[PDB]
Design a protein around this nucleic acid. Structure first.
Ligand SMILES: [Mg+2]
Ligand SMILES: [Mg+2]
Ligand SMILES: [Mg+2]
Ligand SMILES: [Mg+2]
Ligand SMILES: [Mg+2]
Ligand SMILES: [Mg+2]
Ligand SMILES: [Mg+2]
Ligand SMILES: [Mg+2]
Ligand SMILES: [Mg+2]
Ligand SMILES: [Mg+2]
Ligand SMILES: [Mg+2]
Ligand SMILES: [Mg+2]
Ligand SMILES: [Mg+2]
Ligand SMILES: [Mg+2]
Ligand SMILES: [Mg+2]
Ligand SMILES: [Mg+2]
Ligand SMILES: [Mg+2]
Ligand SMILES: [Mg+2]
Ligand SMILES: [Mg+2]
Ligand SMILES: [Mg+2]
Ligand SMILES: [Mg+2]
Ligand SMILES: [Mg+2]
Ligand SMILES: [Mg+2]
Ligand SMILES: [Mg+2]
Ligand SMILES: [Mg+2]
Ligand SMILES: [Mg+2]
Ligand SMILES: [Mg+2]
Ligand SMILES: [Mg+2]
Ligand SMILES: [Mg+2]
Ligand SMILES: [Mg+2]
Ligand SMILES: [Mg+2]
Ligand SMILES: [Mg+2]
Ligand SMILES: [Mg+2]
Ligand SMILES: [Mg+2]
Ligand SMILES: [Mg+2]
Ligand SMILES: [Mg+2]
Ligand SMILES: [Mg+2]
Ligand SMILES: [Mg+2]
Ligand SMILES: [Mg+2]
Ligand SMILES: [Mg+2]
Ligand SMILES: [Mg+2]
Ligand SMILES: [Mg+2]
Ligand SMILES: [Mg+2]
Ligand SMILES: [Mg+2]
Ligand SMILES: [Mg+2]
Ligand SMILES: [Mg+2]
Ligand SMILES: [Mg+2]
Ligand SMILES: [Mg+2]
Ligand SMILES: [Mg+2]
Ligand SMILES: [Mg+2]
Ligand SMILES: [Mg+2]
Ligand SMILES: [Mg+2]
Ligand SMILES: [Mg+2]
Ligand SMILES: [Mg+2]
Ligand SMILES: [Mg+2]
Ligand SMILES: [Mg+2]
Ligand SMILES: [Mg+2]
Ligand SMILES: [Mg+2]
Ligand SMILES: [Mg+2]
Ligand SMILES: [Mg+2]
Ligand SMILES: [Mg+2]
Ligand SMILES: [Mg+2]
Ligand SMILES: [Mg+2]
Ligand SMILES: [Mg+2]
Ligand SMILES: [Mg+2]
Ligand SMILES: [Mg+2]
Ligand SMILES: [Mg+2]
Ligand SMILES: [Mg+2]
Ligand SMILES: [Mg+2]
Ligand SMILES: [Mg+2]
Ligand SMILES: [Mg+2]
Ligand SMILES: [Mg+2]
Ligand SMILES: [Mg+2]
Ligand SMILES: [Mg+2]
Ligand SMILES: [Mg+2]
Ligand SMILES: [Mg+2]
Ligand SMILES: [Mg+2]
Ligand SMILES: [Mg+2]
Ligand SMILES: [Mg+2]
Ligand SMILES: [Mg+2]
Ligand SMILES: [Mg+2]
Ligand SMILES: [Mg+2]
Ligand SMILES: [Mg+2]
Ligand SMILES: [Mg+2]
Ligand SMILES: [Mg+2]
Ligand SMILES: [Mg+2]
Ligand SMILES: [Mg+2]
Ligand SMILES: [Mg+2]
Ligand SMILES: [Mg+2]
Ligand SMILES: [Mg+2]
Ligand SMILES: [Mg+2]
Ligand SMILES: [Mg+2]
Ligand SMILES: [Mg+2]
Ligand SMILES: [Mg+2]
Ligand SMILES: [Mg+2]
Ligand SMILES: [Mg+2]
Ligand SMILES: [Mg+2]
Ligand SMILES: [Mg+2]
Ligand SMILES: [Mg+2]
Ligand SMILES: [Mg+2]
Ligand SMILES: [Mg+2]
Ligand SMILES: [Mg+2]
Ligand SMILES: [Mg+2]
Ligand SMILES: [Mg+2]
Ligand SMILES: [Mg+2]
Ligand SMILES: [Mg+2]
Ligand SMILES: [Mg+2]
Ligand SMILES: [Mg+2]
Ligand SMILES: [Mg+2]
Ligand SMILES: [Mg+2]
Ligand SMILES: [Mg+2]
Ligand SMILES: [Mg+2]
Ligand SMILES: [Mg+2]
Ligand SMILES: [Mg+2]
Ligand SMILES: [Mg+2]
Ligand SMILES: [Mg+2]
Ligand SMILES: [Mg+2]
Ligand SMILES: [Mg+2]
Ligand SMILES: [Mg+2]
Ligand SMILES: [Mg+2]
Ligand SMILES: [Mg+2]
Ligand SMILES: [Mg+2]
Ligand SMILES: [Mg+2]
Ligand SMILES: [Mg+2]
Ligand SMILES: [Mg+2]
Ligand SMILES: [Mg+2]
Ligand SMILES: [Mg+2]
Ligand SMILES: [Mg+2]
Ligand SMILES: [Mg+2]
Ligand SMILES: [Mg+2]
Ligand SMILES: [Mg+2]
Ligand SMILES: [Mg+2]
Ligand SMILES: [Mg+2]
Ligand SMILES: [Mg+2]
Ligand SMILES: [Mg+2]
Ligand SMILES: [Mg+2]
Ligand SMILES: [Mg+2]
Ligand SMILES: [Mg+2]
Ligand SMILES: [Mg+2]
Ligand SMILES: [Mg+2]
Ligand SMILES: [Mg+2]
Ligand SMILES: [Mg+2]
Ligand SMILES: [Mg+2]
Ligand SMILES: [Mg+2]
Ligand SMILES: [Mg+2]
Ligand SMILES: [Mg+2]
Ligand SMILES: [Mg+2]
Ligand SMILES: [Mg+2]
Ligand SMILES: [Mg+2]
Ligand SMILES: [Mg+2]
Ligand SMILES: [Mg+2]
Ligand SMILES: [Mg+2]
Ligand SMILES: [Mg+2]
Ligand SMILES: [Mg+2]
Ligand SMILES: [Mg+2]
Ligand SMILES: [Mg+2]
Ligand SMILES: [Mg+2]
Ligand SMILES: [Mg+2]
Ligand SMILES: [Mg+2]
Ligand SMILES: [Mg+2]
Ligand SMILES: [Mg+2]
Ligand SMILES: [Mg+2]
Ligand SMILES: [Mg+2]
Ligand SMILES: [Mg+2]
Ligand SMILES: [Mg+2]
Ligand SMILES: [Mg+2]
Ligand SMILES: [Mg+2]
Ligand SMILES: [Mg+2]
Ligand SMILES: [Mg+2]
Ligand SMILES: [Mg+2]
Ligand SMILES: [Mg+2]
Ligand SMILES: [Mg+2]
Ligand SMILES: [Mg+2]
Ligand SMILES: [Mg+2]
Ligand SMILES: [Mg+2]
Ligand SMILES: [Mg+2]
Ligand SMILES: [Mg+2]
Ligand SMILES: [Mg+2]
Ligand SMILES: [Mg+2]
Ligand SMILES: [Mg+2]
Ligand SMILES: [Mg+2]
Ligand SMILES: [Mg+2]
Ligand SMILES: [Mg+2]
Ligand SMILES: [Mg+2]
Ligand SMILES: [Mg+2]
Ligand SMILES: [Mg+2]
Ligand SMILES: [Mg+2]
Ligand SMILES: [Mg+2]
Ligand SMILES: [Mg+2]
Ligand SMILES: [Mg+2]
Ligand SMILES: [Mg+2]
Ligand SMILES: [Mg+2]
Ligand SMILES: [Mg+2]
Ligand SMILES: [Mg+2]
Ligand SMILES: [Mg+2]
Ligand SMILES: [Mg+2]
Ligand SMILES: [Mg+2]
Ligand SMILES: [Mg+2]
Ligand SMILES: [Mg+2]
Ligand SMILES: [Mg+2]
Ligand SMILES: [Mg+2]
Ligand SMILES: [Mg+2]
Ligand SMILES: [Mg+2]
Ligand SMILES: [Mg+2]
Ligand SMILES: [Mg+2]
Ligand SMILES: [Mg+2]
Ligand SMILES: [Mg+2]
Ligand SMILES: [Mg+2]
Ligand SMILES: [Mg+2]
Ligand SMILES: [Mg+2]
Ligand SMILES: [Mg+2]
Ligand SMILES: [Mg+2]
Ligand SMILES: [Mg+2]
Ligand SMILES: [Mg+2]
Ligand SMILES: [Mg+2]
Ligand SMILES: [Mg+2]
Ligand SMILES: [Mg+2]
Ligand SMILES: [Mg+2]
Ligand SMILES: [Mg+2]
Ligand SMILES: [Mg+2]
Ligand SMILES: [Mg+2]
Ligand SMILES: [Mg+2]
Ligand SMILES: [Mg+2]
Ligand SMILES: [Mg+2]
Ligand SMILES: [Mg+2]
Ligand SMILES: [Mg+2]
Ligand SMILES: [Mg+2]
Ligand SMILES: [Mg+2]
Ligand SMILES: [Mg+2]
Ligand SMILES: [Mg+2]
Ligand SMILES: [Mg+2]
Ligand SMILES: [Mg+2]
Lengths: 275, 48
RNA sequence: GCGGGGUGGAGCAGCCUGGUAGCUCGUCGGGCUCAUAACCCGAAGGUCGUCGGUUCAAAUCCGGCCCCCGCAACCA
RNA sequence: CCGAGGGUAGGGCCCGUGACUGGGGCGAAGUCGUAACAAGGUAGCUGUACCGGAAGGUGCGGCUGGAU
RNA sequence: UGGGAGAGGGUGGUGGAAUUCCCGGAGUAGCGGUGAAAUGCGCAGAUACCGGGAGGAACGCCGAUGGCGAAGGCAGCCACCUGGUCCACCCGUGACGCUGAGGCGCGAAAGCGUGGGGAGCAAACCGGAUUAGAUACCCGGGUAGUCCACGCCCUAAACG
RNA sequence: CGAUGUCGGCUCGUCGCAUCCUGGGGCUGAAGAAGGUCCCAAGGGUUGGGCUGUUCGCCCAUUAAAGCGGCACGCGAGCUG
RNA sequence: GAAUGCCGGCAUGAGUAACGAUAAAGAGGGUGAGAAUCCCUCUCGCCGUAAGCCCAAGGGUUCCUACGCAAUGGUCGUCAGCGUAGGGUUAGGCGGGACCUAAGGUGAAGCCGAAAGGCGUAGCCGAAGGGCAGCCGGUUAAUAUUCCGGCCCUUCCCGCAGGUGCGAUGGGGGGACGCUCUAGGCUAGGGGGACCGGAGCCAUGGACGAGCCCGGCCAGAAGCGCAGGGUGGGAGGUAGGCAAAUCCGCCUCCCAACAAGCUCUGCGUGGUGGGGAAGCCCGGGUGACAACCCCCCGAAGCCAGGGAGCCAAGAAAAGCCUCUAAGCACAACCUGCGGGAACCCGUACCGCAAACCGACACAGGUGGGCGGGUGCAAGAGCACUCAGGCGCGCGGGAGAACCCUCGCCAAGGAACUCUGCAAGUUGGCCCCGUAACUUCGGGAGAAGGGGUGCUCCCUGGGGUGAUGAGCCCCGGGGAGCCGCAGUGAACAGGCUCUGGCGACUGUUUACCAAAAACACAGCUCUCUGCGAACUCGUAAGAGGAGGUAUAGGGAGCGACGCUUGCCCGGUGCCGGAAGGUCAAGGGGAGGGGUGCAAGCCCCGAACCGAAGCCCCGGUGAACGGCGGCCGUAACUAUAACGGUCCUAAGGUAGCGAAAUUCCUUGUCGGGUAAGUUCCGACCUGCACGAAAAGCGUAACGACCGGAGCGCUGUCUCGGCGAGGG
RNA sequence: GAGCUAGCCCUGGCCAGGGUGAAGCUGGGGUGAGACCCAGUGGAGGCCCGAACCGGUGGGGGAUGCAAACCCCUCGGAUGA
RNA sequence: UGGUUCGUGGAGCCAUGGGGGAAUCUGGGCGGACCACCGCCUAAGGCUAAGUACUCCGGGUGACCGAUAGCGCACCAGUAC
């Protein structure tokens, strides 16, 4: 669910917040957190290289496990489900019988107290991890590796999920959350289910301040600038674009494709995203 | 109102200091010029 | 001031490339119908805004004048 | 003390009237089309939705109060 | 107490036929559509044909002048959860009944909100014809919507 | 053009007379009262408001009358803006 | 002799403006060649959430004393932050270092770059963060948590004793964390006392009094008491915490659990040491054997790493405890005690300012802590006042115009003016009472009105006590008294109606613009499958992001409601393996220079040969665009209808003389005595129109219009008065 | 040259007092169960009034200034972007 | 592509970033596209005085300056500020 407010201030009228129903532990596992080096959007030159960033709430980075083939055959109990400020999804605390504790992204349906496991033999049940080739075609899956032993790269955002469409040789065919049809390697691990917190997108920030909390500084339109600043800049009074609409750096921004043509991974993408 | 000189010794030394000058090719040249001119103080005096 | 027009009753071609005025509509005569509209078959009507000129000959090229359309009339 | 009433302020209901405007009724010798009554020339009617100078049209579902 | 019939309702699964799109093979001069045409599609290889894949929606024969529900309404198949109802036995209760101003719920289609989905169909809209005109009827396209979830709307030739 | 600050208002005036008023006249289609028209006359006077930045103009209520112009469209080393 | 020339000197304005906050002065005594200005006394005024006090920056001897007054001081000067000289800063415990890390900086490894140089995990550096052992008083002209006095504590070295598998840069625990609100118990600080101590006073009509005035504490080891914080104990298994591990993690069992225990802190007491007023007398002496007590208020501070709630989910590392490895177990470490050892730098003074930043002894700026009392609902507000500090480094007169800042005004009350600009009014608190509209929160302190002091009597509830006395807090009900006036002074909304624009709180042209502009939640288009797109850099490497399509970039639009039409010819973007054009290169028909020759050398047709362009198609919340003429209806008028030309298609809804309307003060209506403005209408819209969004919208605005009430020197129309000039 | 100014990063600090009273929770009512309503408790918020503090709306003064942006009155924010 | 007087010119020579890629005296470069002839020279390794440039320093000499000159400084100047 999402939680609405009564309109006792102009902003609380439209503001909505997460329900936090699935959360069972409001404290991070101390040995799994490290400080998050905030950037402000600036690179090693001190130069802003992504605009309009900074001033967000301080965060502690949780160390998440995106390999999971790291501990094949050793089951684990789901001790708690926690809030993670560095992602849209929720995270699950895993207490391995091994005695090791690691975080995974919390799938939808994952119950606190239940047990999960990784490996070619794993039961096809929510929260288990297997190479793609050992997962039944048609079952939905998340946290998918793109290449073997390189870590979960696909379907990690709240509510996302990939789906297996069929097999072809060493590779299997996934339909990524964007709808793109892609061949991913059979040995790539993935975790069955969809990501939890699917309600994430129905949140209405509600006021200028909330975006500021999220480290999102105000964004300024090209049209509201000057000819030095932006292609859309200047003009007496208000003004339309007067040219094909562009980024501050000059390139066209309505329709213009940007994926590199001669990219080697083209051979593995079957159907570019719908819509 | 607040004027432009707001003294701070750490700032002064870490900026126009001797070690600062020696670290950069441009700064070493400052010292060369100042010595060649015969300046009594190659670097801003600051009381640490 | 700069550009563009005036041709059967209406609206448009023809002008640039001189000779050769065309299309739709309307109009008159006759068909079909009880009659009417539609429809079919026939026919009439423009001397091309004018006045001048070039030429063998001017709706056509050129000039004067009338009229209408559009743009401009800024720094002050 | 209460007190006719006068005064100040803010409410409620009613009536009259108002540039302009919405449709309604009648008038009728105007204009445009022909939606309905026959299978009315696309069976009609219907709730709803969108559209059109206008009757109306169309989509969706419904009724026969529909000919053959 | 014992028995029956049924598209009654809800949730989760699931089966085949067909349309569409996509990939491959093979193949060539048209296909489509109509009263007749045209728009449209097709030598940039369409139609028609075989193989594969994807996706949505509706369930042909059974099917009925049938069944079920208070009405709206309900149809492939399976399972679970659940309402109404009829029969037989004539065992139990002892008039505990009927109707019902308000109230409450349910309420086809279209329509609205948020998020999915989107094959076919199809308001609006575009084009081709017909026509005096054709903001229509016919044809080629086509967006909402039609589908799912949750929440609204509460109308009707909601009719026997 | 090595600067002559530019509308209107306020303030303070001063002059011109082609005189709005008041004074004096001739003619009148001047009965009277009131007007018309021209002549003489610059001594004084020449109101308060609504609209608009306005000057101007329209309008209200009065008035003997509600005059027109010059002074760098008088006046920003006087004010306003 | 001229260059608004250059450098210097000296004039003019002129004995003129000014002499730097309107907190303010007056006399007496002293000093001295000289005194409004220096010293002393008394009187007067000003600050007191400071104009007092204590830190940190920064300044760098300005500190203290002696002797001076040429210059500095906006006057004067005997004085001074000035001249000369002499003196003055004392730490194992305060701050920094011999500790730790943060951003960042630097940088073994490694990577990159013409050179210079740019990167870079570790490591190192880097603090106002973590860590860490001193409190009260006394003393100097000047330093003190630094010297002295009392009472405490830390580490290091060594030795003794008891104890133990000791041992680490390695493993683990811990350190270790947000915002808001908050409990119990305390302390700081404060108020009162009929109680305790004290020099004294009795005036001027009264008072020898429960009279007045002054003061009634500070620090303190162990022990203890009160209040908090932290923490389960035992055993078995073990494959995880890059070796090991008895530790930690995980699983099972037993006992304990809102108990305790154990441990750490706060507060109280505490052996002991300190201080100790008014007044009087010359900083000190005295008071004084000073007293050192009870009650109440009470923190934002302490116990603390406490509690609850919420979402935006809230540093690291060392010290510290535990584990074990090499090693070594004559060692080593722990615990207790003893002796010895304990280094470098700062320390003066100013510090909201005459010592810092502003050229000045400059009405400006500058971070943290303390900041008393009474009254006013509260308070860090306001008035007065304590402690302390001041009267601002030119004065004395006079009583013009005029200026500034201020007070009052007859009758009128916006007639002022671009405009109520300005100044009035309103003003705090309690009660009563509040409309359209609305997103149901609001609008709202709407509007409007009543009350407000003091006195006596009666009475209700809470805190602290004890359940009572006293004290403190919140009231209620009667009968009265005085004044023009009871938030009696000071601090403290004028209100309503109605349009435009922007939803809103916010942001902006530092120094002529705070707005309607920017941003904003929210909507849409588009790009991006991750070594992502994109951005910075030549590169390496970075950001994006330790993120992964519910995510990230670009753009437009701008809460929300109802909506967002038609045009793909042109431009752009997207798709299109055909065809056309197409560069290097391939190819070499054929031709040439040359040589006696083989040969060497040059040119070169056909054909093959990318992107891009052409060509085909799509695409509007892509760039953009969205007609002309003529006719027609029972009188006119207009034209639902028709004709025709052009176009890629000819502006749909809605709105409209508008932030847009030229003609224009359009026309009509409202409001006014009068309305170029304003509002409501009309529609021949010069030249609105649908995300450079269209039309509305409650609430909001130091935005921009119009109107009314209230009230005023804005005005008729000026007058008087005050203070600084 | 970022000791002024702009943004961001690390680490600290500051915001008197008063006012309005969201969700939640508890109890009562309500129903078949509910939704819901009511009271109490609670203490939310780019909420309200107003110091510090951050500003700089209007006017007046200042203009060889006290000041190369100041002063007086007035006014905006003041738990948050 | 640079260098040469040589700016694509008939453009050789010297140098070399990319591609291809030999030979050892019958070997190879050059004499301004190219060929022949005639001549010159020995690439792909290194060193090498002197003649030449300069004036911080020392000296000598001026139809050079003489304190607004001559060095920025005759003087406690790269100082005061
Ligand atoms: Mg949920
Ligand atoms: Mg809400
Ligand atoms: Mg709420
Ligand atoms: Mg709600
Ligand atoms: Mg509100
Ligand atoms: Mg609001
Ligand atoms: Mg969330
Ligand atoms: Mg969240
Ligand atoms: Mg919630
Ligand atoms: Mg949740
Ligand atoms: Mg936390
Ligand atoms: Mg850690
Ligand atoms: Mg990190
Ligand atoms: Mg980081
Ligand atoms: Mg760095
Ligand atoms: Mg740099
Ligand atoms: Mg750098
Ligand atoms: Mg960027
Ligand atoms: Mg940024
Ligand atoms: Mg999360
Ligand atoms: Mg969203
Ligand atoms: Mg959304
Ligand atoms: Mg954040
Ligand atoms: Mg954004
Ligand atoms: Mg923006
Ligand atoms: Mg702009
Ligand atoms: Mg720039
Ligand atoms: Mg440029
Ligand atoms: Mg540009
Ligand atoms: Mg532009
Ligand atoms: Mg612009
Ligand atoms: Mg423009
Ligand atoms: Mg602009
Ligand atoms: Mg302009
Ligand atoms: Mg414009
Ligand atoms: Mg603009
Ligand atoms: Mg704008
Ligand atoms: Mg433009
Ligand atoms: Mg353009
Ligand atoms: Mg790949
Ligand atoms: Mg600073
Ligand atoms: Mg300094
Ligand atoms: Mg410093
Ligand atoms: Mg410092
Ligand atoms: Mg330095
Ligand atoms: Mg020296
Ligand atoms: Mg110097
Ligand atoms: Mg230097
Ligand atoms: Mg002309
Ligand atoms: Mg022609
Ligand atoms: Mg011809
Ligand atoms: Mg002739
Ligand atoms: Mg002729
Ligand atoms: Mg002819
Ligand atoms: Mg111009
Ligand atoms: Mg009476
Ligand atoms: Mg019909
Ligand atoms: Mg009909
Ligand atoms: Mg019909
Ligand atoms: Mg029509
Ligand atoms: Mg239609
Ligand atoms: Mg019938
Ligand atoms: Mg059937
Ligand atoms: Mg019986
Ligand atoms: Mg319904
Ligand atoms: Mg809808
Ligand atoms: Mg579709
Ligand atoms: Mg037509
Ligand atoms: Mg639609
Ligand atoms: Mg829709
Ligand atoms: Mg029915
Ligand atoms: Mg029926
Ligand atoms: Mg029936
Ligand atoms: Mg001039
Ligand atoms: Mg001059
Ligand atoms: Mg007479
Ligand atoms: Mg008469
Ligand atoms: Mg006169
Ligand atoms: Mg005169
Ligand atoms: Mg006028
Ligand atoms: Mg009269
Ligand atoms: Mg003038
Ligand atoms: Mg004049
Ligand atoms: Mg002036
Ligand atoms: Mg003027
Ligand atoms: Mg003048
Ligand atoms: Mg003037
Ligand atoms: Mg102006
Ligand atoms: Mg001369
Ligand atoms: Mg000069
Ligand atoms: Mg001069
Ligand atoms: Mg003078
Ligand atoms: Mg002064
Ligand atoms: Mg004063
Ligand atoms: Mg003196
Ligand atoms: Mg003297
Ligand atoms: Mg006080
Ligand atoms: Mg100094
Ligand atoms: Mg001192
Ligand atoms: Mg002196
Ligand atoms: Mg003197
Ligand atoms: Mg003297
Ligand atoms: Mg002096
Ligand atoms: Mg003097
Ligand atoms: Mg001075
Ligand atoms: Mg001495
Ligand atoms: Mg000591
Ligand atoms: Mg040492
Ligand atoms: Mg370190
Ligand atoms: Mg430190
Ligand atoms: Mg210390
Ligand atoms: Mg220390
Ligand atoms: Mg101590
Ligand atoms: Mg021993
Ligand atoms: Mg031990
Ligand atoms: Mg942590
Ligand atoms: Mg901390
Ligand atoms: Mg008190
Ligand atoms: Mg005390
Ligand atoms: Mg206690
Ligand atoms: Mg183990
Ligand atoms: Mg004694
Ligand atoms: Mg005694
Ligand atoms: Mg507080
Ligand atoms: Mg806590
Ligand atoms: Mg670290
Ligand atoms: Mg040492
Ligand atoms: Mg000291
Ligand atoms: Mg100050
Ligand atoms: Mg200054
Ligand atoms: Mg002074
Ligand atoms: Mg008060
Ligand atoms: Mg008060
Ligand atoms: Mg105040
Ligand atoms: Mg004074
Ligand atoms: Mg003074
Ligand atoms: Mg008066
Ligand atoms: Mg009045
Ligand atoms: Mg009045
Ligand atoms: Mg006004
Ligand atoms: Mg007051
Ligand atoms: Mg009202
Ligand atoms: Mg209400
Ligand atoms: Mg009131
Ligand atoms: Mg009294
Ligand atoms: Mg006062
Ligand atoms: Mg107020
Ligand atoms: Mg109002
Ligand atoms: Mg207006
Ligand atoms: Mg608006
Ligand atoms: Mg605004
Ligand atoms: Mg704005
Ligand atoms: Mg907005
Ligand atoms: Mg805003
Ligand atoms: Mg605010
Ligand atoms: Mg400004
Ligand atoms: Mg400026
Ligand atoms: Mg500036
Ligand atoms: Mg400036
Ligand atoms: Mg400026
Ligand atoms: Mg301004
Ligand atoms: Mg503002
Ligand atoms: Mg804006
Ligand atoms: Mg919107
Ligand atoms: Mg770049
Ligand atoms: Mg990198
Ligand atoms: Mg990265
Ligand atoms: Mg990263
Ligand atoms: Mg990301
Ligand atoms: Mg905006
Ligand atoms: Mg196109
Ligand atoms: Mg187009
Ligand atoms: Mg264009
Ligand atoms: Mg072909
Ligand atoms: Mg081709
Ligand atoms: Mg050949
Ligand atoms: Mg165009
Ligand atoms: Mg457009
Ligand atoms: Mg077309
Ligand atoms: Mg249309
Ligand atoms: Mg209009
Ligand atoms: Mg008007
Ligand atoms: Mg308008
Ligand atoms: Mg405008
Ligand atoms: Mg306009
Ligand atoms: Mg105009
Ligand atoms: Mg107008
Ligand atoms: Mg006008
Ligand atoms: Mg007029
Ligand atoms: Mg008028
Ligand atoms: Mg009109
Ligand atoms: Mg735009
Ligand atoms: Mg647009
Ligand atoms: Mg509007
Ligand atoms: Mg509404
Ligand atoms: Mg405003
Ligand atoms: Mg006056
Ligand atoms: Mg007076
Ligand atoms: Mg006076
Ligand atoms: Mg005076
Ligand atoms: Mg800065
Ligand atoms: Mg700054
Ligand atoms: Mg309450
Ligand atoms: Mg609660
Ligand atoms: Mg509150
Ligand atoms: Mg607030
Ligand atoms: Mg406030
Ligand atoms: Mg101001
Ligand atoms: Mg004012
Ligand atoms: Mg004033
Ligand atoms: Mg002034
Ligand atoms: Mg001021
Ligand atoms: Mg002020
Ligand atoms: Mg605040
Ligand atoms: Mg506050
Ligand atoms: Mg906060
Ligand atoms: Mg705020
Ligand atoms: Mg040449
Ligand atoms: Mg050459
Ligand atoms: Mg080469
Ligand atoms: Mg040879
Ligand atoms: Mg050879
Ligand atoms: Mg060679
Ligand atoms: Mg040669
Ligand atoms: Mg040679
Ligand atoms: Mg030699
Ligand atoms: Mg040599
Ligand atoms: Mg000489
Ligand atoms: Mg000299
Ligand atoms: Mg000299
Ligand atoms: Mg020299
Ligand atoms: Mg000199």
């Amino acid at each position: 669910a999402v939680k609405k407010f009564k309109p006792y201030t102009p902003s609380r009228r439209f503001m909505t917040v997460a329900d936090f129903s699935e959360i069972t532990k409001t404290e991070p596992e101390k040995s799994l957190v490290k400080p998050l080096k905030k950037t402000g959007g600036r690179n090693n030159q001190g130069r802003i290289t992504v605009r309009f960033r900074g001033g967000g709430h301080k965060r502690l980075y949780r160390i998440i496990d995106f390999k999971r083939w790291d501990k094949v055959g050793i089951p684990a109990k789901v001790a708690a489900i926690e809030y993670d400020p560095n992602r849209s999804a929720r995270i699950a605390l895993l207490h391995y019988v091994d005695g090791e504790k690691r975080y995974i992204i919390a799938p939808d349906g994952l119950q606190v107290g239940q047990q999960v496991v990784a490996g070619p033999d794993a039961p096809i049940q929510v929260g288990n991890a297997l190479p793609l080739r050992f997962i039944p075609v048609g079952t939905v899956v998340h946290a998918v590796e793109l290449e073997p032993k390189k870590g979960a790269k696909l379907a990690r955002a709240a509510g996302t999920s990939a789906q297996i469409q069929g097999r072809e040789g060493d590779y299997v065919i996934l339909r990524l959350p964007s709808g793109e049809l892609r061949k991913v390697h059979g040995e790539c691990y993935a975790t069955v289910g969809a990501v939890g917190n699917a309600d994430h997108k129905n949140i209405v920030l509600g006021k200028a301040g909330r975006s500021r909390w999220l480290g999102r500084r105000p964004h300024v339109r090209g049209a509201a600038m000057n000819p030095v600043d932006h292609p859309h800049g200047g003009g007496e009074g208000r003004a339309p674009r007067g040219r094909p609409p562009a980024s501050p750096w000059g390139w066209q921004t309505k329709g213009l494709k940007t994926r590199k043509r001669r990219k080697p991974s083209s051979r593995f993408i079957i159907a570019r995203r719908k819509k | 109102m607040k004027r432009t000189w707001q003294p701070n010794r750490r700032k002064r030394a870490k900026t126009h200091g001797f070690r600062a000058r020696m670290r950069t090719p441009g700064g070493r040249k400052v010292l060369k010029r100042r010595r060649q001119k015969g300046r009594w103080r190659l670097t801003p005096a600051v009381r640490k």
